[model samples]
Target: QVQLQESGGGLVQAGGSLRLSCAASGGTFKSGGMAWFRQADTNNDGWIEGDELKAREFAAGISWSGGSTDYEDSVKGRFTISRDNAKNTMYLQMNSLKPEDTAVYYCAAARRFRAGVVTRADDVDYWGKGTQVTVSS
Candidate 1:
């Protein structure tokens, strides 16, 4: 079974940046990809696709195979996603935090087929226990 876990501090100051890490295990890193998502207090939920933040208001995502990244026009300059194959880890970085940015963050892994097709292509099937981040002055 695949598993994901998020690790990071629980607090951030408004205008500062935050970094979170997701450690993955029980699967082959080359098999599929990793995704990062945020559940905002305002009910906005979405994931990173490349450099874009794809969600209620933004979109972003990335591919592990090619290391290609994308981001929505809105969040293009403020978010980043990275991974370490040797360590089976993924990282998410967000800048310019705001009070509304306080929310629960998650990381998920995609499923891969024996035939070498990464299924659930645009969706995450397994999720990590969320990490709560509070932004305050």
Candidate 2:
């Protein structure tokens, strides 16, 4: 019975960082990496570009600027998405945040890529229920 859980503050102050966690249960979390995607309005909304997250190393994470919708290589920032093998939990952090960064952050297993192909695992067979964050005041 594999499951994923996302926990963190739904409301954050403008200019303050946002933090969230995703916990994996019933399956081997180490089998693959973790991914974080941003969603707004509702679950049916399309993910905004630039905030798309991917993991190349184990127990690592990536950060995105919620202020910009465009994907610029120079505007990129780095954040840690670590996993506790013993606890089966993963974490996400968005530093130097803003009001535009407020949204729902979700953590799930990284997409599996096949050999010789540039495709990613977009299915997200497992995912956290999602935690919303609204930056105000």
Candidate 3:
């Protein structure tokens, strides 16, 4: 099985920039963008979404596909996403961090496949280990 390993996470000073990266290897590897998201909550009707998804915004998520990137509403001016297809690695930069920006973050790779259910599409189908991030005041 292919694994996505993340590093440069954990605690960070509240006002400083937070950086993170993940290296992906193995499986049906492809030149693709990577996504980041936080698990929703311990109790939720959408915990499935918490542990999963597409490139989105704020401190909630970010994604990069090829040269372009997507960000969440709260993340618009604060999160930057980038990637290296050759090395199978992805990167993220977080600025204007706050103590509320604490969560278990993950890196996800997008994949395409023939599907009978949704008639085929692309989405982040694989996720890396959860790297905890806490912003200290």
Query: Which candidate number maximizes TM-score?
Result: 1
Model 3, C-alpha of 53: deviation from truth (Å): 15
Model 2 residue pairs with clashes: 60-81, 61-81
Every model's TM-score: 0.73, 0.63, 0.72
Q: lDDT tens string, model 2, 15-133?
A: 67766787777766434355665553233343343433322112123222111121123214734455566776766666666665555666655434222111133535566666776
lDDT of 3 by residue, 20-108 (tens): 88888786445444577665444534233433433222232322335456666766787787777667777778888766566667877
lDDT of 1 by residue, 1-137 (tens): 88888898478788888888888887777765666666532333432234332332223445665366655455567878777778888777888876766656677666453322232334567777778778888
User: Sorted by lDDT, highest first, which candidate order results?
Assistant: 1, 3, 2
Task: Per model, state how many residue pairs clash.
Answer: 21, 2, 7
> Per-residue lDDT for 60 in model 1?
42
- Per-residue error for 43 in candidate 2, Å, reads 15
Evaluate model 3: give its TM-score.
Answer: 0.72
